[PDB]
Design a protein around this ligand. Structure first.
Ligand SMILES: [Zn+2]
Ligand SMILES: [Zn+2]
Lengths: 62, 80, 62, 77
């Protein structure tokens, strides 16, 4: 089931509005996906400690 | 921003240090999708066009990118 | 009657200190209730991220 | 000329803004300070002159209130 791959997109806010509702619907009846998002829900909080500029500098600088 | 205690101030700086380190350790492709979705606010469709891959592949690539990031973050002591 | 139940929002919003975040992740490893709580709240950041802090400040001033 | 997805995105942005406008002032304040300003629990406490524990529970209720609205508005299920 292709949904399993949607966890990160969902938690990062990258799902279009139609995909987001599709996934939220799937989540209500899929304990696996539900547990997947739960594993990742702490990640946006960590990502938010840096600004996009800091991040861009990390890229240019690889 | 309000004043924080000295420990809070240092710990938060340490954290930002490790998080940055973790992102630098991502492969270029994993960092590329994380930068576009989270930092630039782009949608999978938009990322698909800029990067040159199918949207379904943007999704799965993000899935692996975030899971890889997490691995490093745990190894690094930032998250359990 | 367990204080950790109030930390779910601060956790998902990224507002917990590094120290507070560790305690809470520790508690999360053993409390299915708190896990269900953060799971419910985790689409929230993605929704919030669709607006900038400037729009939001403007709204709060009025 | 508007793509179906940019239309839906535009709608969601209106509704989320709208949902944030419907929060009580106290709920909007803690959400604004944690998520949008990136402040810690302790900093929010200092700035508001309330206890740290109160900031946490207040954030707890505020986020849950936001969500109730966003559900009624149809933004999230
Ligand atoms: Zn599933
Ligand atoms: Zn608990």
């Amino acid at each position: 089931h292709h949904y399993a791959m949607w966890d990160a997109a969902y938690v990062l806010g990258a799902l279009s509005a139609a995909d987001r509702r599709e996934f939220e619907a799937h989540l209500a009846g899929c304990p696996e996906c539900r547990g997947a998002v739960t594993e990742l829900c702490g990640v946006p909080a960590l990502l938010s400690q840096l600004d996009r500029d800091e991040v861009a500098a990390i890229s240019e600088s690889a | 921003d309000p004043e924080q205690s000295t420990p809070d101030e240092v710990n938060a700086a340490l954290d930002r240090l490790l998080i940055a380190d973790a992102l630098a350790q991502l492969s270029a492709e994993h960092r590329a999708v994380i930068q576009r979705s989270y930092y630039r606010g782009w949608s999978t469709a938009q990322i698909a066009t800029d990067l040159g891959i199918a949207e379904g592949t943007v999704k799965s690539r993000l899935h692996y990118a975030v899971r890889a990031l997490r691995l490093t973050l745990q190894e690094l002591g930032v998250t359990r």
